[PDB]
């Protein structure tokens, strides 16, 4: 590992600096180094890891969508033949995206998930596993597409089962998991009814638990609840 010689604490410090500088590739590389030290991650550290990779892969996804749209248009009737370049470059971006996903899934498998015993860590990591399989599913067109989809579903479902048993309905990790699994249903699994049902039930059960919260917890939970509402508005 390129970060093998740097102190864990220095990697974490530099990840925070990279975030301030909006250097998300660096942030992700620092956090990968920190994970590879082999110690469990704190709440804050888990969120540094997720922020870094979310931003990297988010940029790749946006680029992939631009290129895919161009490619699709090139394959319409009446479109002039422009050669292999659009496909090649879409493939290049796709391969890099798949590489980042594989990197994240690799960290989760070696060995973040197996050492995560508390609900807040285990659910967080299983949500990440679902998310990165979902990103693989977005670009999948081959023999393994169904298996990739099922891998996302399975990770999300395990996270959901733990979250329902172990966390209150307003817990932000539980809420974010449900938000994203709902999107999985809508966008990946061709299950819009399941997506809508999950978002609605999640919202309503959270609403009923807000009375238990401090002002600060209320703010956190209601922010994610609004995202559930936004998706419901988009879909209905």
């Amino acid at each position: 590992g390129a970060m093998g010689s740097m102190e864990r604490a220095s990697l974490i410090q530099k990840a925070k600096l990279a975030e301030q500088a909006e250097r998300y590739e660096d942030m992700a590389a620092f956090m990968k180094g920190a994970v590879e030290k082999g110690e469990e991650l704190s709440c804050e550290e888990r969120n540094l890891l997720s922020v870094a990779y979310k931003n990297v892969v988010g940029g790749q996804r946006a680029a992939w969508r631009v290129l895919s749209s161009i490619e699709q248009k090139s394959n319409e009737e009446g479109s002039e033949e422009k050669g292999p370049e659009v496909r090649e470059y879409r493939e290049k971006v796709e391969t890099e995206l798949q590489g980042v996903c594989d990197t994240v899934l690799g960290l989760l498998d070696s060995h973040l998930i197996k050492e995560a015993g508390d609900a807040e860590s285990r659910v967080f990591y299983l949500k990440m596993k679902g998310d990165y399989y979902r990103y693989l599913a977005e670009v999948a067109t081959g023999d393994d597409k169904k298996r990739i989809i099922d891998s996302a579903r399975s990770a999300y479902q395990e996270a959901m089962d733990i979250s329902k048993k172990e966390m209150p309905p307003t817990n932000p990790i539980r809420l974010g998991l449900a938000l994203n699994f709902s999107v999985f249903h809508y966008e990946i699994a061709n299950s819009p009814e399941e997506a809508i049902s999950l978002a609605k039930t999640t919202f309503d059960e959270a609403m009923a638990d807000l009375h238990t919260l401090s002002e600060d917890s209320y703010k956190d939970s209601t922010l994610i609840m609004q995202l559930l509402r936004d998706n419901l508005t988009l879909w209905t």
Partner: peptide
């Protein structure tokens, strides 16, 4: 696109 976190 829909919201995720």
């Amino acid at each position: 696109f829909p919201a995720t976190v």
